[PDB]
Design an enzyme around this catalytic site. Sequence first.
Site, short mmCIF file in Angstrom:
data_model
loop_
_atom_site.label_atom_id
_atom_site.label_comp_id
_atom_site.label_asym_id
_atom_site.label_seq_id
_atom_site.Cartn_x
_atom_site.Cartn_y
_atom_site.Cartn_z
N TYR A 1 48.18 60.13 5.79
CA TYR A 1 47.04 59.42 5.80
C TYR A 1 46.03 59.67 6.57
O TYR A 1 44.77 59.83 6.50
CB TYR A 1 47.43 57.73 6.00
CG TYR A 1 46.05 56.94 5.75
CD1 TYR A 1 45.73 56.23 4.74
CD2 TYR A 1 45.31 56.72 7.32
CE1 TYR A 1 44.55 55.63 4.54
CE2 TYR A 1 44.16 55.57 7.07
CZ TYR A 1 43.82 55.40 5.76
OH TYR A 1 42.68 54.59 5.38
N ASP B 1 38.20 53.60 7.75
CA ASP B 1 39.70 53.45 7.96
C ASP B 1 40.11 51.96 8.44
O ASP B 1 40.45 51.71 9.59
CB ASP B 1 40.39 54.46 9.01
CG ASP B 1 41.83 54.45 9.23
OD1 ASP B 1 42.51 53.73 8.53
OD2 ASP B 1 42.24 55.03 10.23
N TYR C 1 53.76 52.59 2.70
CA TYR C 1 53.02 51.61 2.20
C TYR C 1 53.31 51.21 0.81
O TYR C 1 54.15 51.53 0.38
CB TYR C 1 51.62 52.39 2.00
CG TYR C 1 50.63 52.16 3.39
CD1 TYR C 1 51.00 52.84 4.57
CD2 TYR C 1 49.39 51.84 3.27
CE1 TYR C 1 50.40 52.93 5.77
CE2 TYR C 1 48.53 51.90 4.42
CZ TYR C 1 49.01 52.27 5.75
OH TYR C 1 48.08 52.41 6.66
C1 LIG Z 1 44.90 50.35 12.62
S1 LIG Z 1 43.60 51.16 11.02
C2 LIG Z 1 44.61 51.11 9.46
C3 LIG Z 1 45.83 52.22 9.74
C4 LIG Z 1 45.44 53.47 9.35
N1 LIG Z 1 45.52 54.50 10.69
C5 LIG Z 1 42.77 49.42 10.57
C6 LIG Z 1 41.67 49.19 11.71
O1 LIG Z 1 40.43 48.65 11.11
C7 LIG Z 1 40.04 47.83 11.95
N2 LIG Z 1 38.78 47.01 11.39
C8 LIG Z 1 38.95 45.93 10.60
N3 LIG Z 1 37.85 45.31 10.23
C9 LIG Z 1 36.74 46.18 10.88
C10 LIG Z 1 35.44 46.07 11.05
N4 LIG Z 1 34.85 45.33 10.38
N5 LIG Z 1 34.90 46.90 11.72
C11 LIG Z 1 35.49 47.92 12.54
N6 LIG Z 1 36.76 47.99 12.47
C12 LIG Z 1 37.53 47.26 11.79
C13 LIG Z 1 41.16 46.98 12.74
O2 LIG Z 1 41.06 46.38 14.11
C14 LIG Z 1 42.24 48.21 12.59
O3 LIG Z 1 42.53 48.58 13.75
#
Ligand SMILES: C[S@@H](CCCN)C[C@H]1O[C@@H](n2cnc3c(N)ncnc32)[C@H](O)[C@@H]1O
Lengths: 273, 278
Positions: free
Chosen positions: B69, B164, B221
């Site tokens: 991913y 992401d 997933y």
């Molecule tokens: C861990 S990552 C998913 C796995 C793929 N490497 C998903 C991240 O998106 C962030 N996330 C979720 N919503 C937001 C928004 N609105 N803004 C920024 N980051 C976000 C959340 O804290 C996770 O760490």
Amino acid sequence: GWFREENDQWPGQAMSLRVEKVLYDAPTKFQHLTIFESDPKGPWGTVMALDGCIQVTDYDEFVYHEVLGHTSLCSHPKPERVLIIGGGDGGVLREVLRHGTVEHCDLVDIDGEVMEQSKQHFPQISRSLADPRATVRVGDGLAFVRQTPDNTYDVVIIDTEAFYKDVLRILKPDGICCNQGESIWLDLELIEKMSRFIRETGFASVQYALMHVPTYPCGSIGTLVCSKKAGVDVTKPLRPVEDMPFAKDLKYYDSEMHKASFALPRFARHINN
Amino acid sequence: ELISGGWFREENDQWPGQAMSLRVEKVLYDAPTKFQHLTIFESDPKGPWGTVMALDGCIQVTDYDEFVYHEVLGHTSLCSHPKPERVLIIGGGDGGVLREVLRHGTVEHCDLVDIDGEVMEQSKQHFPQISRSLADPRATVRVGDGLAFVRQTPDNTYDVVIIDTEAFYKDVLRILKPDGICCNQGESIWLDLELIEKMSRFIRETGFASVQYALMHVPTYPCGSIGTLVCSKKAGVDVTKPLRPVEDMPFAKDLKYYDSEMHKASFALPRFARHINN
Ligand SMILES: C[S@@H](CCCN)C[C@H]1O[C@@H](n2cnc3c(N)ncnc32)[C@H](O)[C@@H]1O
Ligand SMILES: C[S@@H](CCCN)C[C@H]1O[C@@H](n2cnc3c(N)ncnc32)[C@H](O)[C@@H]1O
Ligand SMILES: O=C(CCS)Nc1ccccc1
Ligand SMILES: O=C(CCS)Nc1ccccc1
């Protein structure tokens, strides 16, 4: 209750499905055979497991059935006689029978109980078992091919040394072989081993095609696609399915997915050179 | 509240009647953050999965398939752009996409905004291979809402935006340069095909010139795959063939999933899903 699936080789995980109605659950002469309807609020419909490994679900059976069936046949110049070893649910045969070139198909499956349960609980998979271009046997494929003459079949699909040697022996000079290969995530060593054994047995080429099957462990499986004839590139369809009349009835397989199936993650690409 | 030697079980309200579970060997974190429940644990050491991160009970990262991913998102987008110097990653708190983007010599600066600073902390401690990029000084790492962050950014700041995680997607279009690429965590062709159709149509109608969906194999997933919508701000660009192949860059051989062949193959969809892409 729940059907749980796990594996002692991959010790700390499991995958479960809710059982809505047990439809069959008995030892057979050769394996444990379980069929049940899953959650009607989910998509899986009817499910079949063998020695506790899901083998077939209503939901995605089309994937593995079209890939084995058409990747192999569309790699042949004109496939007329076809052997299926195992395949007792009939799904591959259904897919084999779409091809007009096909004059006859033998299907050999060790387990009579599998086909019977299939006619009973998987109508859209098993119809093909009573087709007049097919002959259906209950027996060991190992023996069956040892008792088959040279130059009998254009395509051998294995949906389960002297065996692999026999298979090459029963194919005609443009023979195409495919099998159910394992997973690149769980059986990569074994895929590498097979590929090389299969080639040293005397097949000119062996190429691995990856497909997406949600209900199998890690979400994918593949097939080794093998050419008796040298100079054949199985990875680009020899006779595209788009020219045959059944193309638009397919739910997974087409020419772009054919080609794409042979692109492997870099960690696995050494299987295909 | 999870404890070592028990099992982590995941289910979904939305697809009743399936469950998935992992044996827990050791809990490294299990608490609410001011945004979500965050779970980290080592899995069975006789299995391949290593450390595992869950958010709100959905697994999100394992040591195991992590690279798929992250490499697909970093490279499909960057290799589709003529000269990606300034990059934004929204979400990506674990550091994984950012490690992939930073491989690229043309990247001059990369901002990443993730709403949850705990995700970034726990990645530092528990996923060192994923999160080392987070300390890189070619990166700037802010804790913030990506939506408010894009809103406060001026026009034509970015060559590439990687999501992401309508006013949002229009901002995304606005903050990109005329040459911009946006890609996102798409969902699954098996679980939300309708959603993918809808997102794509409306990213187009928002004003993106093209949007193509790239499929990848991710065994951890749901249903074992996931996708990314690869969207081009400018017309006449074909993201499905690498603009700058990675094979001509120094780091191609370090990658575990992505290369040019994988790039082109990821846009081929099973027939039932191919209308997404035409
Ligand atoms: C861990 S990552 C998913 C796995 C793929 N490497 C998903 C991240 O998106 C962030 N996330 C979720 N919503 C937001 C928004 N609105 N803004 C920024 N980051 C976000 C959340 O804290 C996770 O760490
Ligand atoms: C159910 S099918 C796999 C499901 C995808 N169509 C696997 C079949 O191969 C048979 N099988 C297993 N071993 C053999 C041998 N040795 N010979 C023939 N058929 C075999 C077994 O009975 C299953 O029906
Ligand atoms: O990896 C698998 C199954 C086959 S690889 N299960 C799984 C592991 C971790 C997370 C989610 C699922
Ligand atoms: O099909 C799925 C999940 C997502 S597609 N799970 C599953 C399949 C087989 C057995 C147990 C679970």
